[PDB]
Design an enzyme around this catalytic site. Sequence first.
Site, mmCIF file in Angstrom:
data_model
loop_
_atom_site.group_PDB
_atom_site.id
_atom_site.type_symbol
_atom_site.label_atom_id
_atom_site.label_comp_id
_atom_site.label_asym_id
_atom_site.label_seq_id
_atom_site.Cartn_x
_atom_site.Cartn_y
_atom_site.Cartn_z
ATOM 1 N N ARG A 8 3.403 3.747 6.490
ATOM 2 C CA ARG A 8 4.378 3.014 7.298
ATOM 3 C C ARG A 8 4.686 1.621 6.778
ATOM 4 O O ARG A 8 5.092 0.738 7.536
ATOM 5 C CB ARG A 8 3.885 2.953 8.744
ATOM 6 C CG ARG A 8 3.780 4.337 9.374
ATOM 7 C CD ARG A 8 3.082 4.326 10.725
ATOM 8 N NE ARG A 8 2.702 5.675 11.157
ATOM 9 C CZ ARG A 8 1.991 5.949 12.251
ATOM 10 N NH1 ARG A 8 1.567 4.962 13.043
ATOM 11 N NH2 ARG A 8 1.695 7.212 12.551
ATOM 12 N N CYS B 94 -5.310 0.979 7.791
ATOM 13 C CA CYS B 94 -5.007 1.419 6.410
ATOM 14 C C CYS B 94 -6.035 2.444 5.923
ATOM 15 O O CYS B 94 -7.247 2.190 5.985
ATOM 16 C CB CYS B 94 -5.055 0.199 5.454
ATOM 17 S SG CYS B 94 -5.007 0.587 3.662
ATOM 18 N N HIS C 92 -1.923 -3.906 5.208
ATOM 19 C CA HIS C 92 -1.589 -3.488 6.551
ATOM 20 C C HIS C 92 -2.785 -3.057 7.313
ATOM 21 O O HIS C 92 -3.818 -2.682 6.785
ATOM 22 C CB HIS C 92 -0.523 -2.383 6.607
ATOM 23 C CG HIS C 92 -0.979 -1.077 6.062
ATOM 24 N ND1 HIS C 92 -0.897 0.091 6.782
ATOM 25 C CD2 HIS C 92 -1.531 -0.749 4.868
ATOM 26 C CE1 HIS C 92 -1.386 1.088 6.061
ATOM 27 N NE2 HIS C 92 -1.779 0.604 4.897
ATOM 28 N N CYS D 217 0.827 -1.198 0.000
ATOM 29 C CA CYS D 217 0.000 0.000 0.000
ATOM 30 C C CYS D 217 0.851 1.233 0.000
ATOM 31 O O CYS D 217 1.883 1.278 0.613
ATOM 32 C CB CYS D 217 -1.000 0.041 1.193
ATOM 33 S SG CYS D 217 -2.017 1.550 1.279
ATOM 34 N N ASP E 217 0.189 3.874 1.495
ATOM 35 C CA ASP E 217 0.139 4.380 2.890
ATOM 36 C C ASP E 217 1.486 4.336 3.597
ATOM 37 O O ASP E 217 2.364 3.507 3.314
ATOM 38 C CB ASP E 217 -0.843 3.561 3.766
ATOM 39 C CG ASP E 217 -2.254 4.043 3.690
ATOM 40 O OD1 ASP E 217 -2.457 5.219 3.423
ATOM 41 O OD2 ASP E 217 -3.173 3.258 3.941
HETATM 42 ZN ZN LIG Z 1 -2.911 1.387 3.354
#
Ligand SMILES: [Zn+2]
Lengths: 179, 173, 179, 173
Positions: free
Chosen positions: B12, B62, B59, B8, B10
């Site tokens: 982290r 998310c 994850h 992803c 995103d």
């Molecule tokens: Zn994500």
Amino acid sequence: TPHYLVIACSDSRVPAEKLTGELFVHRNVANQVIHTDFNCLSVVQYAVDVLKIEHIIICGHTNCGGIHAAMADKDLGLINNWLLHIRDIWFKHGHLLGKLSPEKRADMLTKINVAEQVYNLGRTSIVKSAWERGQKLSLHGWVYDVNDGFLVDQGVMATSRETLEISYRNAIARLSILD
Amino acid sequence: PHYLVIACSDSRVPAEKLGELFVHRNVANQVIHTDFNCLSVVQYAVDVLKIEHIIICGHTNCGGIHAAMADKDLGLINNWLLHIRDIWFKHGHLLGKLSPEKRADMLTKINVAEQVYNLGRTSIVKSAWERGQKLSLHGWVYDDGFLVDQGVMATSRETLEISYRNAIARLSI
Amino acid sequence: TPHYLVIACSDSRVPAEKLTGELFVHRNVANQVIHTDFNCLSVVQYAVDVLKIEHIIICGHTNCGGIHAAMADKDLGLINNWLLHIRDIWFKHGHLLGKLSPEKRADMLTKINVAEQVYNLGRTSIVKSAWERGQKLSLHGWVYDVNDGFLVDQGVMATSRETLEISYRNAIARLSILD
Amino acid sequence: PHYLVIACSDSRVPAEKLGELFVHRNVANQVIHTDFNCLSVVQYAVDVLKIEHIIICGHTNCGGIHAAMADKDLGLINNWLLHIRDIWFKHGHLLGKLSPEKRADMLTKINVAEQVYNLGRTSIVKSAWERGQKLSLHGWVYDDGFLVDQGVMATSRETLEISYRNAIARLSI
Ligand SMILES: [Zn+2]
Ligand SMILES: [K+]
Ligand SMILES: [K+]
Ligand SMILES: [Zn+2]
Ligand SMILES: [Zn+2]
Ligand SMILES: [Zn+2]
């Protein structure tokens, strides 16, 4: 909540973090912003309009498999359609690249590529809308050298459409001055 | 390189946390049947780089999943996330009988399973299984730094069906 | 300046005009509105937001090569990825279609398909935005029968998101009542 | 069916005006290298239906071309039309030395040539030329009911280059 969107190449040793939790990241073959690519555009529209991100950075790199493959006249299949946008950029700068030692051309096309993609980014409705309603947003074009770990900013930098034209135009003129 | 990792965009979720990695990152780690971008990545890795493993890593917590569940006019990205709303509906009965607190987590895992299921149904992967090429697919979910779910793991169309059904059945407990 | 957008299948005898200068037209394999398809979405966003079109009509047809091919377990190449969205719809209605004489299933999937695509259309940001700012816009799902030249409206009809849910939901319930 | 026709979604452009036609229609009759939709159509026709002719038909007084030239925030469609702005720039010197009245018409023709050039460079068409399959590509522009420009006509990668260069050279008169 991150401050940077990085667009980078899926190639192996290139990771946005490592390279430079503050990063939103998109990775595709040869770090492309194609005008009609829903995947990259959706990353860009979410980052800009939703997460209020203020920097977008397009990072290419030397010794890029994508770039090399786009220059090889080769029947690889689907991926060849993805890389036709790179071949279009090649020919847009054919005089320049032709004037160059064949084994230097990859490195130059990597650099040119980054400028072209920023220029594409800078012309998205997402980015122009955002600039035009006074949202603060800056675009950067970098090339990272795998041979010596050193980033190499390309002085494509834009905070507005007027500045986009100027730095795009200058970055190409600088690259055409041959060492 | 030996692994293609699809993860992803995103914040982290760095592939490296786990030189041999070819990476793709998009909102909610999706393999949309008709996404030229992700599919290109898949075709190049499988047919050209000869990668033998593809790993879909989602994850927890998310933003893609959360936004897909929220009714919100976010603009373009909403269209991207309609494929996850379709997946919510596909498992709407499972997700209904569940505390509104923990739906995101479940749908995060189900999402991973569905993307592997999509990946294993691409012409690219099917026709490479069919010509004897060794290729395995994995569906992970990541957090405290650990992997929470393995679930789907496929080496052939046959093993795709089985791992997918069983992964969904384990989640419906 | 046209009043209707028609989305139809690229298959041979299906032409929007012939069938029914007033038409804006998009044609793709199995008359699909895929949520992330830049091509169809761009037609839809231009029609709705720019040409102020007030009717969008999705027309499938019987004996559709796209539908047939999506149901055949067959290695055709790229197109198989396009038609995986049809296969997803098939399985979403597997109980229903399974209960049917194998040589009737194509015709049913054509019908189901049209309802699904309207439902997709009705959930685009373009269409919801437009409905939500009070723009007048109606969506229709039709199936045209090549065997007897007769259109066959499917009573998927939506003028709002609430009406979208209702007619989608009813159209599927009507189709599940087996002659 | 024997022809695939790729034409503009715009109002007065029915493929039939000219049972053997497989049709695709999109804004400004484009073949974008990475457009899964159009490419699917092309692959199915070439590899499955065995079509031997693909015809890109543009038209005069086309809203796609006009909008691509106008500076206007139209939203999504603008992104679709950036590929035509790239083509404007590619031939910016030709189009500059021309009366602002008649630029649309010229760019309408140039656009057709560029889409055929793109079509002939798809893996699909190249690899079908390479395995001996008979396949010709055509670039028409249509109005009073007549066809105005033929220009590009290709039966092999070799003939693609020649017809494309020559078509552009004829337009630069
Ligand atoms: Zn994500
Ligand atoms: K795409
Ligand atoms: K597309
Ligand atoms: Zn690279
Ligand atoms: Zn059809
Ligand atoms: Zn037109």
